[PDB]
């Protein structure tokens, strides 16, 4: 590895022109060329542009490359949401018996998104989990933006601290956030209240979905 | 039409190495120079190294020392075998075929990235219960229902439903990092209300590290 400088990060408006540079040197650069990869988290990284300028099946036109001298530039006109990922660059370097070279990569961030209210599903213990002997309250909440929300577990109407698990919200592919929230209680403790309650807050708004145990 | 296919055990901690492989299919073993690379989040995205069907190879320099990349002709793969891994080593690897060495040059090919932990603490596989179907929440007409994954390491976890025939209407939550330091999550799909107790629903969770496979049913609630 050698050095493909990239900006740390780019940002913009929907709609509007984007671009992510790349400085190299004579020996990258200066004499390969370049292509262009999007990063998602969790995934290969995808093909966006190849031999400086061209785009792979199925890669808006939106997508468009230029090089100039040991520069290379990515712009994406036309902004959306889902825009949101890492940008490397990424060349072939005379050096030893040649070297392939990611950039440092630059996070790109649409702004001025709407905010988006939480959906919550909030699931009982199942009756197998309290045949094992444990219970576990799953609270669910999806399709929220921006990526905070806070979460408050009740037993009846008294607050529940102990046994709670909470996840730090992450964007979704809808490109709105998710998050989850576990409440751990003994099944005697499910069984000897009235209900237990998910209580997720957002953006000054509140949603509470209450489950009980059954009784047949 | 050109498919690469990541198989291998991943992480054997009796030996600390790490080993995959990729299958081509659709193009012939000549077609592409085959590379690894890796990415983690903090780190970026790092070449690995390359191999030619010839056998010849070149590695990023940092590695050279401890990774072996091969080629099987016979069997249309390439391989990764990194030797004296360490939790540093945990990524999202990929296998691709560059096109260095190739006069038409028509973009490369690119397999799938699986993230391969590596970890010094004990492997835990997942419980797996029912979240059993639930309206309350969801548009009118359906239901949601779900599995819960409870109390494995390392991630990853994959759940799909009735064996991938069911796509629609699926949301795997992330998991969440437990205070123990071990993992659950929550897979859930929506589904027609009228299709309950006819139409079966089964989550299909995989977790690799552990070897471990579970199918579960999941049936709405009753007596
Ligand atoms: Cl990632
Ligand atoms: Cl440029
Ligand atoms: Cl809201
Ligand atoms: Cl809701
Ligand atoms: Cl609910
Ligand atoms: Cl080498
Ligand atoms: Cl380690
Ligand atoms: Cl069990």
């Known amino acids: 590895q050698s050095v493909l400088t990239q900006p740390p990060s780019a940002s913009g408006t929907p709609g509007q022109r984007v671009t992510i540079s790349c400085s190299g040197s004579?020996?990258?650069?200066?004499?390969?060329?370049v292509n262009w990869y999007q990063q998602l988290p969790g995934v290969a990284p995808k093909l966006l542009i190849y031999?400086?300028?061209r785009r792979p099946s199925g890669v808006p036109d939106r997508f468009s490359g230029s090089k100039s001298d040991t520069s290379a530039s990515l712009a994406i006109s036309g902004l959306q949401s889902e825009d949101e990922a890492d940008y490397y660059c990424?060349?072939?370097?005379?050096?030893?018996?040649?070297?392939?070279?990611f950039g440092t990569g630059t996070s790109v961030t649409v702004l001025g998104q709407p905010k988006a209210a939480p959906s919550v599903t909030l699931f009982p213990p199942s009756s197998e989990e309290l045949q094992a002997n444990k219970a576990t309250l799953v609270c669910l909440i999806s399709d929220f933006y921006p990526g905070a929300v806070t979460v408050a577990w009740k037993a009846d109407s008294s607050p529940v601290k102990a046994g709670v698990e909470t996840t730090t919200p992450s964007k979704q592919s809808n490109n709105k956030y998710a998050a989850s929230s576990y409440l751990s209680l003994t099944p005697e403790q499910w069984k000897s209240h009235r209900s237990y309650s998910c209580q997720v807050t957002h953006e000054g708004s509140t949603v509470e979905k209450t489950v009980a145990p059954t009784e047949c | 039409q050109v498919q690469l296919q990541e198989s291998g055990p991943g992480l054997v901690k009796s030996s600390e190495t790490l080993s995959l492989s990729c299958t081509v299919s659709?193009?012939?073993?000549?077609?592409?120079?085959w590379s690894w690379v890796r990415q983690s989040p903090g780190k970026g995205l790092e070449w690995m190294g390359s191999?030619?069907?010839?056998?010849?190879?070149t590695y990023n320099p940092s590695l050279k020392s401890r990774l072996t990349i091969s080629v099987d002709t016979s069997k249309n793969q390439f391989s990764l075998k990194l030797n004296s891994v360490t939790a540093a080593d945990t990524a999202v690897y990929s296998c691709?075929?560059?096109?260095?060495?190739?006069?038409?040059?028509?973009?490369?090919?690119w397999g799938q990235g699986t993230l391969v932990t590596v970890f010094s603490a004990s492997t835990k596989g997942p419980s797996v219960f029912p979240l059993a179907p639930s309206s309350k929440s969801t548009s009118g007409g359906t239901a949601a229902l779900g599995c819960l994954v409870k109390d494995y390491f390392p991630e990853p976890v994959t759940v799909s439903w009735n064996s991938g025939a069911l796509t629609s209407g699926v949301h795997t939550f992330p998991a969440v990092l437990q205070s123990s330091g071990l993992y659950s999550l929550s897979s859930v799909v929506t589904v027609p209300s009228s299709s309950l107790g006819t139409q079966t629903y089964i989550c299909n969770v995989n977790h690799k590290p552990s070897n471990t496979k579970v199918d579960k049913k999941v049936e709405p609630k009753s007596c």
């Open positions: 691709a075929g560059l096109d260095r060495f190739n006069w038409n040059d028509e973009g490369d090919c």
């Open positions: 659709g193009a012939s073993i000549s077609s592409y120079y």
């Open positions: 191999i030619y069907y010839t056998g010849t190879t």
């Open positions: 004579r020996s990258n650069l200066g004499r390969n060329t």
């Open positions: 031999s400086n300028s």
């Open positions: 990424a060349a072939w370097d005379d050096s030893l018996n040649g070297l392939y070279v």
